[PDB]
Write a protein that binds this ligand. Structure first.
Ligand SMILES: Cc1ncc(COP(=O)(O)O)c(CNCCCC(=O)O)c1O
Ligand SMILES: Cc1ncc(COP(=O)(O)O)c(CNCCCC(=O)O)c1O
Ligand SMILES: Cc1ncc(COP(=O)(O)O)c(CNCCCC(=O)O)c1O
Ligand SMILES: Cc1ncc(COP(=O)(O)O)c(CNCCCC(=O)O)c1O
Lengths: 442, 442, 441, 442
């Protein structure tokens, strides 16, 4: 049940007048480099629709980059936010604490993998979350080196840039970068030089390399996205993540899962690591956690997090009470409406339609992902060379028909589906039809 | 002015009370041990100058959440704005689907920041993110590496902002290695100058010569400084220091970044602390007071600098959140409607009055600050040696009597007044009387 | 013509009494970690022999890690050192200059590849040379990032550690390391996941990765050893180096060849890059340059090196006059006795005997050029490394009076680095002892 | 007794024809930037004379930057070199060891301060020596941070550049620099803002700053030149070095004395630390050690040096046998001819003549140093402002008269006397007369 009509509806040309008016204002005051993928301006976002200031209704297949999984306007979240704001907007937990912070931490304790003793701290952005996971790994182990992987993306602060693989646009001319970061090869099945390589073997490759080029006893943390997001929704071969987890335990290395994009029901489980039952030492979270309000978290082993001295982790806004109210509601919606189930159902629908399309075409290199985090990697016809041209084209074509869809990938050639998990089957099918049509058209 | 909850100090028996204790018990099972709070009671409502706890106790708020809730923790305008905006959409990610709130906030910041030259703005979530982004811009725009920060500086808890921060405990210990090419230079700190007669101009020459000999002016991307150093101890530089650095920075092509995260938005009696001396920074970093408690931060700077950054080079997921933007517009509106600059100047007069009366009745080393950002540096009796022990004592004493007051300083010996600017004279005086009684008592 | 008898001769058990005496003195005063691969102490080294203080004569198949290519006692070098020392040991070129420095510089200008304008600066160690190449790349280009490769070795200073791939023993617990260094995959034919990969394709793999993870216009320098030494005498597939060179030129990136181990006739050409006619923008040199005296150098494009401001490059000892005399003599000997030719002849002999051994399995790969050759040892019937056999063989060779070195990322490569003045007779004797040792284990 | 006539003799204009011929050759093949302070080319250097290729004889007041303390042509060194080279030029100690290495190490053990267990490793340059001291400190303590001082100079590798204070010409455009290096204030009496500050107080200032900005238990090493060379022959106030030493011991920090310039009799004692009886944990050496041949060393506590794993420290050329023969001879000459005594005698003569000059003038700011490591800091007439102009002038004037003298200093305004210790009284006086005349002339 929704608030605004859940149907795709484009009334004439866009951007419309009111959108154009805003663009004009924008170019006088916002930095030129801050671009938007979409030229229309939101007035309402709800269920699977973005409606613009000129009354056009677009299908939302990005959920704000995997943020509004509960929908951009979940009545529970809205209510929670409205009520909390009326009491106090901020007191800074480090100064005067409040129940919202604790309550959220209780939930994250419960929902994260593993049954061992865990603790949590809250911050605002995903970047902050990763920054804090690495601080904890470094302090708790007494070691320096952090290993990240090819195709990794972890943020836009200096260290998270360091941890991020792709240079354009995230890194160029923003260094020098935080030291003692090392990059290791990823399990990326579709582009392995030896297509027969298994996950275990891909892990052994990374491990040998870490051991020869750093030494296991020198590494503070291994940080990896269980499904790499911006890198192109790369899902590692079965057996890779457990092999890294087991080795990390053996060498005393903190294993950090970055579940900022993949966390909170997005993949059909509470966390992407749950597909393989990997139990990380620390997990970084943001995006979906608070239904669009700015909140992020790390939850990890009590012995690691409790090692940090008093006042060593924190920030001003972190664990904001309005954001916390949002999160508690958001999580509540995830449970009440079985969004894990909704995500699994989306996978079935969408992989269905996408595989039908593969069977007609050839420009479709690889279809992959889990739950509501799915992707199609587009290639040059008859080879494996990347096709970023087609990818830009298809996004634009979708936008023209009233479907907002995101792209990604190291080679710029991956279309990603990140619908809100509360999307209706009707809308999702409509979106997929538009997408399918667009690919065939170019 | 008019408030929602009774604006009187009122402590009903022992605290923490039962409901606060119940929350502390829940907390210790789920929140990291290191995340400590200065205050053992839990907020239910925060409004005007009162923090009221879950057990009905009403404390005087002399910290405004570390200079965040300048408009008050429950300004009706902010609340209304938040409530309305949340019902439309919580988040779409400005980099994907843009929205008026972002543009409007940017319009305001353009207008209110110093200088009449072309300026642009980008929005993020935390102060740390802001500083991170100011430095990215300086580095990209100038093509240089080095960034100079000062003794007693504080800029944040990400790896780079830790690098920029001077004090190691608790902000840095065991969290490195730190981002490279950061250099530290001496501050104008009148009360502790080895030559008490040194002028601001001379203090600037000292820094400048040192920068030139140890880096070289043409190698420095940015000089970053807090016009009044916050966590360092509300250190106000001698008159003539800031303009000398500004002038030299212009001469050498160095971006001059004013970190106005704590001092910005009326806190000091002007819109920005740099306005006291008419310094016009090349970039200014903002957060805290900007959005009346909601999580928002910003950089506003020369258009030619900010527009230099390539498309998609600056950003983030949550940044410039629409609910936070609504809050900011309302917060700024309240600052104008109720002349909080004026209120801040009036607070300066009242508080510096009472504090100087106390000095006249010796443990009071130095009284300093501007507006609603004031401090008393406490020393050992009859000398200049720091007195952290008395400082902790006084803060505890004040808490006991129902006044929440913050401390800071490189040497742990500074009591800081950061009341909300909407505080009543009656409450402020009560608070200052309690503070003055506490100092005399220990 | 040699000075000491060029025959292998072990008189009983070693270390002998005089060597033992020195070991005892050593353990009181030299840091415990500073270990030597050989337990006997030199008194004379000449041609292909190391003779110890107890009169034992070992075959020298390491030349001091590719340093004494002209021999550890070339009469020309000796004479030149002796004469130059009697005039002055040092004045510091940056203060009072001297002909020796200029002369050496003239030679390096001539002997290095390319006909473009080149300039040179002199230092002491290979690490210093690499450090200074990178300084020049960084200043000249105005960029930060430097790319090195898997299996690289470039030195023991903080930055050259940073550039070096292998952590044990060169890096462990010595960081944090100098920033903006990126590591890229090497062309290592024997261990490519796709055995059919060509040099051109290996280059494209590296180039795409550099471009995606740094950006070509952000890279100050690409630094590579034409034949990777400590990494295991890895020779890249044909077409790899020229591809990197061409791309570097396209993107304005300084291409640094590290010819510290491979330079000066060691591979059969003046420089290892000459095999493929690659012309580097800067080349780093040490080791063989001065017949054992401490000297190192960078020689590169005049426009790059002249970009550096006055007094930006230097050091105290650098371009020491005694070392310079030694270098002029050493280079002279390389020409007069055609050591390039001697090196090529050594390749023929040694690859011959090594391939015979492969016939009759533990021999994974035989590779190298000139007097820089290697055999990579593997577990019987697979490609798994065999460091155990490698240590064993080295020890077995030592026992029989042959000093031979090991190397490799996986600790499983026997390397031949004989002095280029070695006699066929001695070399064959050494190779027979080596072959015997491999068969024995 | 000497080999070439020990008298100043300039025969007409220079550079002469043969020198000019070499300059012409040079400019085609040596990098432009590699400049020499002297335009004539050496043929022989012996005792206190540099004789050029055109037969001119200059007084040598630099000893090759404090290298040829025994003279540039000590017969013992020459003989030793000649004999050693005939046996073998190099075998690489890590491969095939040799007596020369061990013997040198035996000497350095004996001559360095302290009676505790010590060990030594040998390298080639001073930079390499400092690099290795820091490796050891880091590996042995398991900590990262290294503190160096204002006016410090330690070398031209990336890390030793990091450690070095002055940017022109040593650092400009050569970064980014090795991380975790922190800079602390030096005891520099002549330019202290409080002229009455004691060495103990200067130490406390550094220590409090290290403690507040890094934390003692985070610092691997404190590295300092007992007399700062390139920084301007700055001699710290009495009590500074022992204070740092005592504190380092308390906090488990390796105290590294960089005696590369000041070591081996240069200051009138075997090492400059011997003036105050400071016993360093490691000491770095080069220059004088081997009478002009390239050799350098670290000698320090056995427990520190032996902590390094097998093969962790080394290099190809390091501890070269010809250089070792030179060293054993050089050290032997230092003892046989009591160069400590000669240095002390030089101090008396030179400080005498320099103080006479001070009494006539005013442009002489400060006279300082010990032994044969002495300096005069030149200032603007009647003030303390630096006088680099006069300093360059005086060096050129001295050169014109046939006296080669060096300059240095953070501010470019210090004349330094680094004569070889085997210089005759007659020659030294002649040189000082020329210098005194030059200062009076400009
Ligand atoms: C996997 C993963 N980790 C961290 C982040 C960073 O989170 P925040 O932007 O700081 O909240 C992300 C973000 N991904 C979306 C890309 C946004 C952008 O700015 O381009 C992530 O996926
Ligand atoms: C001057 C100044 N700059 C940056 C910050 C960082 O802002 P955020 O806390 O990341 O939003 C601050 C903040 N100061 C409050 C100290 C925070 C703490 O963790 O103790 C600042 O003052
Ligand atoms: C290729 C290459 N580059 C630099 C070096 C360093 O030379 P120096 O030892 O600094 O003079 C080297 C050195 N190779 C020998 C390494 C042995 C060791 O363990 O030090 C090199 O090969
Ligand atoms: C005090 C001190 N420590 C180290 C060095 C470096 O020695 P090397 O030059 O690398 O052997 C020095 C060197 N000082 C001479 C400066 C000459 C120059 O490079 O400009 C030193 O004084």
């Amino acid at each position: 049940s929704y608030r605004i009509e859940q149907k795709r509806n484009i009334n004439g040309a866009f951007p419309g007048p009111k959108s154009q008016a805003l663009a004009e204002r924008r170019s006088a005051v916002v930095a030129a480099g801050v671009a938007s993928g979409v030229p229309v301006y939101v007035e309402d976002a709800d269920g699977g629709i973005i409606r613009d200031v000129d009354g056009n209704s677009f299908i939302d297949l990005g959920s704000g980059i995997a943020v509004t999984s509960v929908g951009a306007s979940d009545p529970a979240v809205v209510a929670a936010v409205q009520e909390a704001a009326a009491h106090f907007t901020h007191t800074c937990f480090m100064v005067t604490p409040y129940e919202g912070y604790v309550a959220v931490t209780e939930q994250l304790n419960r929902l994260t993998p593993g049954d061992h003793a865990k603790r949590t701290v809250l911050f605002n952005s995903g970047a902050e979350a990763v920054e804090n996971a690495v601080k904890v790994a470094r302090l708790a182990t007494g070691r320096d080196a952090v290993v990240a992987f090819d195709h990794a993306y972890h943020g836009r602060t200096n260290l998270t840039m360091a941890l991020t693989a792709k240079a354009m646009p995230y890194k160029t001319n923003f260094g020098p970068f935080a030291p003692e970061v090392y990059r290791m090869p990823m399990s990326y099945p579709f582009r392995e030089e030896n297509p027969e390589i298994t996950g275990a073997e891909a892990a052994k490759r990374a491990i040998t390399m870490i051991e020869k080029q750093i030494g296991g006893d020198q590494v503070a943390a291994i940080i990896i996205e269980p499904i790499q997001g911006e890198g192109g929704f790369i899902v590692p071969a079965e057996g890779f993540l457990p092999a890294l987890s087991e080795w990390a335990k053996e060498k005393g290395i903190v294993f950090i899962a970055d579940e900022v994009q993949s966390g909170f029901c997005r993949t059909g489980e509470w966390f992407a690591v749950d597909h393989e039952g990997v139990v990380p030492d620390i997990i970084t979270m943001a995006k979906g956690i608070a239904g669009g309000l700015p909140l992020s978290a790390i939850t990890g082993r009590a012995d690691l997090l409790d090692a940090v001295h008093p006042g060593g982790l924190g920030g001003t806004y972190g664990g904001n009470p309005v954001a916390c109210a949002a999160a508690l509601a958001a999580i509540d919606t995830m449970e009440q409406h079985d969004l894990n189930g909704r995500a699994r159902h989306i996978e079935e629908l969408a992989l269905g339609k996408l595989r039908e399309l593969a069977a007609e075409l050839s420009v479709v290199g690889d279809i992959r992902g889990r739950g509501a985090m799915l992707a199609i990697e587009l290639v040059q016809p008859g080879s494996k060379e990347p096709n970023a041209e087609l990818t830009k084209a298809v996004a634009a074509a979708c936008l023209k028909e009233g479907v907002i869809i995101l792209t990604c990938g190291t080679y710029g050639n991956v279309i990603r589906l990140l619908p809100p998990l509360v999307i209706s089957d009707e809308l999702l099918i409509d979106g997929l039809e538009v997408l399918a049509a667009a690919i065939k058209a170019h």
